[PDB]
Amino acid sequence: TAAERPPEETLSLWKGEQARLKARVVDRDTEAWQRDPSFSGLQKVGGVDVSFVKGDSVRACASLVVLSYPELKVVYEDSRMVGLKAPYVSGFLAFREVPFLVELVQRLQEKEPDLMPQVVLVDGNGVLHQRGFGVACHLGVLTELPCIGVAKKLLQVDGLENNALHKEKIVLLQAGGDTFPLIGSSGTVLGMALRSHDHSTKPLYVSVGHRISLEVAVRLTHHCCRFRIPEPIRQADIRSREYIRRTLGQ
Amino acid sequence: ERPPEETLSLWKGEQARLKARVVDRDTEAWQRDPSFSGLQKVGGVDVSFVKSVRACASLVVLSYPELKVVYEDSRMVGLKAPYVSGFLAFREVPFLVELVQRLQEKEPDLMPQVVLVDGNGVLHQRGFGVACHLGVLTELPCIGVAKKLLQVDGLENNALHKEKIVLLQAGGDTFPLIGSSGTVLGMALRSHDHSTKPLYVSVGHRISLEVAVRLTHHCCRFRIPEPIRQADIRSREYIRRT
């Protein structure tokens, strides 16, 4: 039943919790380094990942890393095998993994409180979401850490579509740092498509999680990119997959 | 790990004995045909080893020129010989032979007219790589296809060698691998237009080098020749079906 889709009875409660927690999202900058032209004052950037074991519908590995800024060197790392309770359901990602991420942050607080990250990059959307409250917002509100949503595929919500027009806009992205906005049918700006480095063509889709503005989230994500995937998320995923490989006796 | 020297010494002796049976010229009418008219069946083999000792050996037969799979067989194999460069056949050739015998017993009309092998033929420490070994034990024509240069008889993947690779610009372009002896051990082959890393092609058995290289090029939809690529896909897929 860990792989079984939750009943509608359960999904409705999850929608209720998302609406409750959404009132606490802060979609502007609240940190001094975020208003600094060079992010002076930013020293620690977090990244998270949860990799789900390929045969097990029951095993996953959750990882948290903290990187120095601007050097992007790993100064803290933690991976844990966890037991899954819910499958992937689009729009409800937080409910299969956010408790593991929260526990990772609490373990950091108990073990190395001086390495608490000043912002966390999350593998998943923030406000670009069926109900405006994706996993990056969910983590932000439960920890009160600033959070950025970094997605690798476009969530087709509020009129967004990976159609021919969208693919043309991607072709128009010519260098790392170039962007185009993700606009809902309401006209609201849900996020930005970002070409993350010169030698990638598939963009990241960046949205606000918590306690950050969209322009700052985009700039910082760009600055964290040595490859397509931002180094905090990339290093977390590397560790999750390595730990799974070791656990699976290899 | 590595086998004792007494064992490698016996294996070198065996390689020398069998090498006398290698035929390094064309013996099939389709081989001298400008289009390989008469060639209908091209085999490929692969043996994938999980780094316990479990491994999977696969044989495919493809139609020519269409390169469609007409026969496939994947067998879990269980022997424990380690990889020793120059002695590859001694960890896998009996299982390749057994695949060929299974084809003969099950679909004798699909027996391949030539087999592409992942590993060298005469490009080898003692002139008798796994592709020759398979050729002599089955008497099928065999082509050795390697992805890295075996540094033997003075061949070296140095800057000079890397300059020649840069000069390979189109699928089908080649340069010969000339040993310090003056012997031509094989050819470097740019196997298609959108790959820069060459294949190293050598004679296994009952084929000339010029025919082996041309046929290998014709079997390449991607960098790796389609018979080998399809056997490898099946070995890994079979293993993943743990």
Side-chain angles (χ1 to χ4, degrees), chain A residues 28 196 230:
Chain A
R28 49 182 169 82
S196 58

Side-chain angles (χ1 to χ4, degrees), chain A residues 65-100:
Chain A
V65 296
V66 185
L67 279 58
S68 56
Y69 187 90
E71 300 83 11
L72 301 180
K73 293 306 177 56
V74 173
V75 296
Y76 175 89
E77 64 193 330
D78 187 24
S79 301
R80 184 136 51 102
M81 297 298 303
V82 294
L84 294 172
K85 261 73 190 180
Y88 172 68
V89 188
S90 183
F92 299 105
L93 178 55
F95 294 91
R96 102 180 294 213
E97 64 180 21
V98 87
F100 310 128

Side-chain angles (χ1 to χ4, degrees), chain B residues 17 21 57 78 103 138 166-167 171 182 185 202 215 224 229 239:
Chain B
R17 280 184 263 113
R21 284 168 90 116
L103 175 49
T138 66
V166 164
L167 291 185
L185 284 84
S202 55
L215 179 55
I224 304 308
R229 185 174 169 264
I239 287 171

Side-chain angles (χ1 to χ4, degrees), chain B residues 79-125:
Chain B
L79 231 9
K80 305 85 196 303
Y83 172 69
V84 187
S85 182
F87 301 98
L88 177 55
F90 292 85
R91 104 183 295 214
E92 65 183 22
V93 89
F95 302 103
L96 301 179
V97 171
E98 181 73 7
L99 287 177
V100 173
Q101 184 59 41
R102 281 169 57 79
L103 175 49
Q104 172 63 25
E105 291 165 358
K106 295 176 157 224
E107 300 221 78
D109 291 342
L110 298 181
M111 182 69 55
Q113 288 160 284
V114 59
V115 177
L116 287 52
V117 182
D118 19 31
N120 302 292
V122 300
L123 173 45
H124 184 259
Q125 289 87 335

Side-chain angles (χ1 to χ4, degrees), chain A residues 1-3 5-37 39-102 104-250:
Chain A
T1 58
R5 179 177 214 269
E8 295 302 317
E9 187 176 6
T10 298
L11 264 32
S12 312
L13 290 176
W14 291 354
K15 297 179 187 177
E17 173 79 340
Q18 292 178 320
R20 284 182 221 109
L21 296 177
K22 190 157 120 65
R24 281 178 171 203
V25 169
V26 173
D27 70 342
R28 49 182 169 82
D29 301 302
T30 61
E31 314 302 307
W33 62 262
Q34 293 168 330
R35 270 75 60 92
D36 190 276
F39 301 146
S40 298
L42 178 63
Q43 301 188 265
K44 291 166 295 169
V45 176
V48 293
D49 178 79
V50 187
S51 174
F52 303 86
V53 182
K54 74 128 106 192
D56 249 289
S57 76
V58 191
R59 295 317 283 177
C61 182
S63 294
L64 169 65
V65 296
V66 185
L67 279 58
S68 56
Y69 187 90
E71 300 83 11
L72 301 180
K73 293 306 177 56
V74 173
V75 296
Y76 175 89
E77 64 193 330
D78 187 24
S79 301
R80 184 136 51 102
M81 297 298 303
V82 294
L84 294 172
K85 261 73 190 180
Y88 172 68
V89 188
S90 183
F92 299 105
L93 178 55
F95 294 91
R96 102 180 294 213
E97 64 180 21
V98 87
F100 310 128
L101 302 178
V102 172
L104 287 175
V105 172
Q106 183 57 42
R107 287 175 63 79
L108 174 49
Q109 172 63 26
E110 291 167 359
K111 295 293 158 176
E112 303 245 45
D114 291 343
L115 296 181
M116 183 68 55
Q118 287 159 285
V119 58
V120 178
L121 298 203
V122 181
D123 51 326
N125 297 289
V127 301
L128 187 179
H129 184 260
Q130 287 87 336
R131 291 159 292 278
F133 191 77
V135 67
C137 306
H138 208 132
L139 182 65
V141 164
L142 289 184
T143 67
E144 279 295 353
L145 296 170
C147 287
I148 298 174
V150 186
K152 311 191 245 298
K153 313 187 233 137
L154 174 69
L155 182 58
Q156 300 197 353
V157 108
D158 191 7
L160 300 176
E161 273 175 71
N162 183 11
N163 59 15
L165 176 63
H166 188 79
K167 294 187 177 60
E168 295 178 357
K169 298 179 177 167
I170 290 173
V171 165
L172 292 184
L173 300 181
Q174 290 296 85
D178 295 343
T179 61
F180 67 85
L182 311 170
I183 317 297
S185 294
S186 53
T188 55
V189 178
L190 283 10
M192 304 278 328
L194 164 68
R195 177 149 177 171
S196 58
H197 77 96
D198 285 357
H199 302 110
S200 181
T201 52
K202 198 187 173 192
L204 307 172
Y205 301 103
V206 178
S207 55
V208 167
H210 187 46
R211 290 186 182 288
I212 196 165
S213 70
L214 178 56
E215 171 273 290
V216 169
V218 170
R219 226 163 91 236
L220 179 54
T221 295
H222 180 214
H223 282 72
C224 292
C225 282
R226 298 207 187 290
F227 301 98
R228 178 181 182 243
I229 303 307
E231 202 61 10
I233 289 166
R234 183 173 169 264
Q235 293 299 324
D237 178 72
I238 287 175
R239 275 157 184 77
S240 283
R241 296 167 51 77
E242 191 182 23
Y243 196 72
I244 287 170
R245 252 198 321 120
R246 254 77 126 156
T247 291
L248 268 27
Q250 69 202 12

